[PDB]
């Protein structure tokens with residue numbers, strides 16, 4: 001089974017750079033846009049917040065509460081989640097999963113701490129990687145720091161610490177529309193039993209097929225969806241056509 005995940009970069013409760021969906025009352029409203037995606041076949045949403053520190057905590061909690069009210073598919077929230085209490089408030093307020101990267105690399109036990117209370121399934125570790133001198137290396141602080149840690153080693157440790165999913169982000173392909181980094185995905189696939197979410201490089205429908213052939217369990221994309229370079233229901237139809245298994249109350 002494969003998942004298509006829409007990623008929305010948000011700031012001050014707005015979708016950064018908005019969208020091309022003229023049928024929407026507000027093409028820059030993350031809740032309405034997310035709601036719409038859920039109705040046309042997106043399997044999950046992922047929100048990445050870049051609000052300034054002062055209002056950030058409150059803005060992210062308001063976001064997840066509003067989203068959880070209106071949508072029924074799973075969603076992830078991320079962006080500067082650095083400790084357990086921040087992760088916890090967001091999950092309790094409505095998010096299904098939290099995404100972490102830098103804070104996990106600096107304190108791998110953070111993975112375990114969140115999973116202890118909320119289950120491994122609530123913990124998504126984003127791994128940003130790039131080729132450096134012929135090796136896949138792990139990068140932190142939004143791609144600014146080469147940690148010197150090998151991708152191979154961090155993937156294995158991440159599963160060991162109890163993460164539920166890995167987002168595998170190729171800095172080599174980010175923003176290029178040249179396609180997902182399938183060599184990187186194939187490199188990581190045999191190292192872990194966790195679901196792998198491909199991120200970085202999506203430009204056309206065929207890129208998604210290639211990513212799944214590489215062993216990804218999900219594929220995440222941003223502006224190619226919001227600017228409607230790819231249509232969600234067309235993409236699902238296309239994937240199904242070529243043999244990809246795509247899909248189309250607790251007290």
Ligand SMILES: N#Cc1cc([N+](=O)[O-])ccc1O
Nearest residue numbers: 007046047048078101126142
């Ligand atoms: N969600 C998300 C997301 C995360 C990162 N990131 O953790 O570098 C980048 C782009 C994104 O859309």
